[PDB]
Design a binder for these strands. Sequence first.
DNA 1: TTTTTTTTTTTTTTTTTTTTTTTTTTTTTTTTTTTTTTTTTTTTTTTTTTTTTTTTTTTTTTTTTTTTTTTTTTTTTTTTTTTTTTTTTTTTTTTTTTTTTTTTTTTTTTTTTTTTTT
Length: 48
Amino acid sequence: KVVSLIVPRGDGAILTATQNGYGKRTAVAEYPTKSRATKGVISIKVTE
DNA sequence: TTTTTTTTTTTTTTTTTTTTTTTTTTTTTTTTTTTTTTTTTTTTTTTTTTTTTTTTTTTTTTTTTTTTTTTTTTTTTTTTTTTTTTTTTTTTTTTTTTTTTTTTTTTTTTTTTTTTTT
């Protein structure tokens, strides 16, 4: 689990995750919840 | 009139030093070889309407393992000190300007003499 990239909030806006093999997706920053450090996974995409 | 003392430059040739001819090592320089940029056209790739059957998200409910959690003791973090490097004031040296002071060299042309080589 190599950390690919970090992005701040900035403002209410749309995140766009992507994939190696032509995978492209968009989502709103309101969806992913927040918590303290040293935590687990929030499934962002359907990989593999 | 004969004979006696002292002084130096030469017979000097050898020791010391200097001068003058030499050729190993790091810094230049010309060559070939590999990275860049602009056109033709060319099959080839690629942009954009229409239809279509698809396959993943959103009604609703479930749980469990990652999110809660408190606490011991480490160990990375910070503090002081000192060394190494970077960078900028300071100083020194050198060059150019225009009137002055000084100098120094390379060749033709002919004819005669020295001065080496064969």
